[PDB]
Write a protein that binds this ligand. Sequence first.
Ligand SMILES: O=c1ccoc2cc(O)cc(O)c12
Length: 343
Amino acid sequence: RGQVFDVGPRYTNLSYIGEGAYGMVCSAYDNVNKVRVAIKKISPFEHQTYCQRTLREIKILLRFRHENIIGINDIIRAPTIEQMKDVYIVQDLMETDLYKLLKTQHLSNDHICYFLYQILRGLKYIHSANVLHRDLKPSNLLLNTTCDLKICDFGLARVADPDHDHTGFLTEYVATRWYRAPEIMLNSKGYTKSIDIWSVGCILAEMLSNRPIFPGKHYLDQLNHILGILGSPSQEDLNCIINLKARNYLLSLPHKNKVPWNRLFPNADSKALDLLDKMLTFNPHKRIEVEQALAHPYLEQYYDPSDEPIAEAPFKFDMELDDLPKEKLKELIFEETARFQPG
Ligand SMILES: O=c1ccoc2cc(O)cc(O)c12
């Protein structure tokens, strides 16, 4: 989605950055703030899925205000719904992301520590709003040249719903395979906060070695990669999987002993590995919570709960947007973007 790039007179001296899952991304000079910013041209109005994700992201990002979550500084669009055919989203310029950094750069322990702190600080706010991100991974963590980290891509986000999380074995799932918690493949729809903690643990492992820890090649391969490192689940953890197809799949597998974290990550700080172990815990009920992770000894130099804000306005709104005709989705996008119009 990119050809014309008409961002009015405020933004000039445009440079192409790339394509995304919505359209085209450029940098531009903000003649009001006198800084270079990122601008995304979104052309979603042809497909239900793009419109749903666009509405979801705009609604969430306009409600959230946090240093470790990307914000929206401005939205440019036509003054009427009839003329609205693109939407331009203006954001702070972030020169890289963790995916790109990990392909070429070794991270010092101090950087791993700082990045993890920022991820968890942002996630604390998201979770305090009763929101689940559900697609945390290196490419959804933006960084600027001073190492400020901001979480992005709320296209798969949902309101937490633990009472309706249960599903059968092998239920289809959308979020990126390598960062899926084991329970997704067994009995979970990904409607609890523990699914995001698993993804952070995978990101931590990837920061330690520059390689994905569980690079499954297919849906069930993801689970087998996890079990190849964690070892076979204990009787106690298996008794928490009540659905027979999932239980009996696990019981059919050969016994595997746990691979020690220090053999996988021989150069890692021992406190980092202790926290990694608690994030990559098989049983989601025993898995560490975001605030316990912030309080872990590994992060003691940064931990400051009074400087780790929570949301004022937790979500009870609709982020499913599934039973809405495209006409109403377009109208809702128009209404959500109205605050940036001169009027
Ligand atoms: O460079 C970027 C590439 C894609 O997504 C972004 C999102 C932002 O909010 C800020 C950015 O600079 C980028």
